Paper text:
[name] proteins are composed of three N-terminal [name] domains and a single C-terminal SH2 domain (reviewed in Ref. 3). [name] recruitment is required for complete T cell activation, and its inhibition dampens TCR signaling by reducing Zap70 phosphorylation. The objective of the present study was to initiate development of an inhibitor of the [name]/TCR interaction, specifically by blocking binding of the first [name] domain in [name] ([name]-[name].1) to the PRS in the [name]ϵ subunit of the TCR. During our studies, it became clear that [name]-[name].1 exhibits conformational diversity and can swap half the number of its residues to form a dimer.
The swaps are located at the exact same position in all structures (i.e. Lys-36 in the n-Src loop), clearly visible based on the high-resolution electron density. The interface thus generated contains a short anti-parallel β-sheet encompassing the [name]ϵ sequence 36KSWW39. Superposition of the [name]-[name].1 structure with the bound [name]ϵ peptide shows that domain swap and tight peptide binding are mutually exclusive. The C-terminal half of the [name].1-binding sequence would get into steric conflict with the second [name].1 domain in the dimer. All of the dimers are swapped in the same manner, but with different juxtapositions of the second [name].1 domain with respect to the first. To assess the structural variability of the dimers, 38 individual chains with well-defined electron density throughout were superimposed onto the first half of the molecule. The hinge at Lys-36 provides quite a bit of flexibility that allows the dimer to pack in many different crystal lattices. Indeed, the hinge region varies over ∼6 Å within the superposed ensemble, and the distal loop covers a distance of ∼8 Å in the dimers.
Author numbering:
A (entry chain C): 4 to 33, 35 to 59
B (entry chain A): 5 to 59
The structure:
Amino acid sequence: EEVVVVAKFDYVAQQEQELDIKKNERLWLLDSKSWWRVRNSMNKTGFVPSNYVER
Amino acid sequence: EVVVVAKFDYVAQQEQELDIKKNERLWLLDDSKSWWRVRNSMNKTGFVPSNYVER
């Protein structure tokens, strides 16, 4: 259920949940949800789709 | 770091995701930062900022 996308720039993972990629690398993306990293009041962080959440 | 409000429940599907409830207030870790979950050729998956990737 995927499409091959291409990295535009090197990205250096800042946290274990992130992915190191190099410029021009072929990657597989899903269906292509867009995610925000957030933290709740019990101080747990994680990703949620950004269309579930409002400023 | 700004406060955001959950518009709907979200049930985490992976350990990196976060369960939220409708109307829950959360802290958004970096505004102007949307993430895509991608997988590389060695089958490692992780989140990358979406503007580093070209579709």
